[PDB]
């Protein structure tokens, strides 16, 4: 009987795809719990275990410009919006597991790509050949679940528990952008040839993978002032990695070179054309109520074209 409520403006705004969670860090746990309750009921988690899990997850996010606690909660909110707009499509286990996956998808990120770990010869690159950081994020998730008082899935049978951790694992692995290209191409073809079947677990996994990409890229679907300021954080990370590449004696790609800041607007165009528009396009074909994400993405592309033309 202990509901969560948000002030009127947030209560209304949080149902929308383009919601910004605000600068008050101390409200984000309350926002997450609010979203879990409206997404799978007040019963599905023990409130004292859930709060303990959230604070341990927060502790294990680092103070990096972009891949921080704020990103985690932004990505979870976008999944909440997708689940609330496609209510009857997903199971009780998928709903429970996917919000947790989004909150944990970047645990212990230091602000470096898999590519820099490979070139630095980091121990995580020996432990994990592909999806280095994403296999690490899932390891960290399992660690926090195994702390005393943190098992939020305590009332799930052994079958259910293994199912929910396999959803979480695949959801987190899918946030490796290198895997997105193949996954989206295969979903496009299954849709065009009419073979896509949401009763096939194999096709379901691909669809959840695309949802995870969409949630992870969702900064490109905000209102222009939020999109434009988040790009400052994204490039702060990229340029830091560029600097570390130069210390290994490797020329960074231009995107990561802080000496080529002039090329940013043209580079965003590339990304919107090559990644973001194709992602939300294919997602809207499979889940029509996610149209607003595609609309907002197109809006922001047109804003970057105005920046290139000095408007």
Ligand X SMILES: O=c1ccn(-c2cccc(C(F)(F)F)c2)nc1-c1ccnn1-c1ccccc1F
Interface ranges with Mg ion (CB under 5 A): 106, 175
47 C-beta neighbours (distance < 10 Å), count? 13
Non-local CB neighbours of 273 within 8 Å, separated by 6+ positions: 301
- CB nearer ligand X, residue 54 or residue 255: 255
Residue 291 has which token pair? Answer: 């149209």
Question: Looking only at residues 144 through 203 of this chain, which bind ligand X when binding is defined by CB under 6 A?
Answer: 177
Query: Helix crossing, 291-308 with 277-286: angle to 10°?
Result: 160
Q: Which stretch binds Zn ion (CB under 5 A): 5-13, 99-107, 275-283, 295-303?
A: 99-107
Residue in 31, 144, 217, 297 binding ligand X, rule: CB under 6 A:
217
> Does 296 engage in binding with ligand X (CB under 6 A)?
no
Residue 67 annotated as binding site:
yes
Of the candidate spans 101-109, 183-191, 201-209, 235-243, the one that interacts with Zn ion by CB under 5 A turns out to be: 101-109
Tell me: is residue 109 an annotated ligand-binding position. no
In whole angstroms, the minimum distance from the beta carbon of 69 to ligand X comes to 16
Is 71 labelled as part of a ligand binding site?
A: yes
Ranked by CB distance to ligand X, the top (closest) residue is 271
Nearer to Zn ion, 66 or 153 (CB): 66
When CB distances are held under 5 to 8 angstroms depending on the partner's kind, the choice from ligand X, Zn ion, Mg ion, none that residue 234 binds is: ligand X
Identify which of 204, 199, 246, 234 has the alpha carbon closest to the alpha carbon of residue 94: 204
C-beta of 39 vs 175, nearer to Mg ion: 175
105 assigned ligand-binding residue: yes
Q: Is the dihedral of CA 65, 99, 226, 175 positive or negative?
A: positive
**Smallest distance from the beta carbon of 222 to ligand X, in angstroms?**
10
Q: Which of 144, 220, 286, 297 binds ligand X (CB under 6 A)?
A: 220
DSSP SS3 for 254: helix
Residue 141 interacts, among Zn ion, Mg ion, ligand X, none and using kind-specific CB cut-offs from 5 to 8 Å, with none
Give 216 or 241: the residue with its C-beta nearer to Zn ion.
Answer: 216
Q: Does 271 bind ligand X (CB under 6 A)?
A: yes
DSSP 43-66: TSS-HHHHHHHHHHHHHTS---SS
Q: Which is nearer to ligand X, 94 or 233 (CB)?
A: 233
Which among 45, 41, 158, 19 has a CA at the least distance from the CA of 100?
A: 45
Token pair listed for 39: 């997404």
Residues designated catalytic: 67
Question: Is 216 an interacting residue with respect to Zn ion (CB under 5 A)?
Answer: yes
User: Has 259 been labeled as part of a binding site?
Assistant: no
- Write 39-48 long-range contacts (CB < 8 A, 24+): 39/80, 39/83, 39/84, 39/95, 39/99, 40/92, 40/95, 40/96, 40/99, 42/2, 42/3, 44/92, 44/96, 45/96, 45/152, 46/152, 46/154, 47/2, 48/149
Distance of CA 20 to the CA centre of its chain: 15
Binding-site positions for a divalent metal cation read 71, 105-106, 216
Judged by the rule CB under 5 A, the positions of this chain that interact with Zn ion are: 106, 216
Binding interface with ligand X (CB under 6 A):
177, 217, 219-220, 234, 255, 268, 271
Extract the annotated binding site.
67, 71, 105-106, 216, 268
């Amino acid at each position: 009987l202990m509901q969560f409520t948000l002030p009127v403006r947030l209560c209304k705004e949080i149902e929308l795809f383009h919601f910004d969670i605000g600068p008050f860090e101390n409200m984000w746990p309350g926002i997450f719990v609010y979203m879990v309750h409206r997404s799978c009921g007040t019963s599905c988690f023990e409130l004292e275990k859930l709060c303990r899990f959230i604070m341990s997850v927060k502790k294990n996010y680092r103070r990096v410009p972009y891949h921080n606690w704020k990103h985690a909660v932004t990505v979870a909110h976008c999944m909440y919006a997708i689940l609330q707009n496609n209510h009857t499509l997903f199971t009780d286990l998928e709903r429970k597991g996917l919000l947790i996956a989004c909150l944990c998808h970047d645990l212990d990120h230091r602000g470096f790509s898999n590519s820099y770990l490979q070139k630095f010869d980091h121990p995580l690159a020996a432990l994990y050949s592909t999806s280095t950081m994403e296999q690490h994020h899932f390891s960290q998730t399992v660690s926090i679940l195994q702390l005393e008082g943190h098992n939020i899935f305590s009332t799930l049978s052994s079958s259910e528990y293994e199912q929910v951790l396999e959803i979480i694992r695949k959801a987190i692995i899918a946030t490796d952008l290198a895997l997105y290209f193949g996954n989206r191409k295969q979903l496009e073809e299954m849709y065009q040839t009419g073979s896509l079947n949401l009763n096939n677990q194999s096709h379901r996994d691909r669809v959840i993978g695309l949802m995870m990409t969409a949630c992870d890229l969702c900064s490109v679907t905000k209102l222009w002032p939020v999109t434009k300021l988040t790009a400052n954080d994204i490039y702060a990370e990229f340029w830091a990695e560029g600097d570390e590449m130069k210390k290994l004696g490797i020329q960074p790609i231009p995107m990561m070179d802080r000496d080529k800041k002039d090329e940013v607007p043209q580079g965003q165009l590339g990304f919107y054309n090559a990644v973001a528009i194709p992602c939300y396009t294919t997602l809207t074909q499979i889940l029509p109520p996610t149209e607003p994400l595609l609309k907002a993405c197109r809006d922001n592309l047109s804003q970057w074209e105005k920046v290139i033309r000095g408007e």
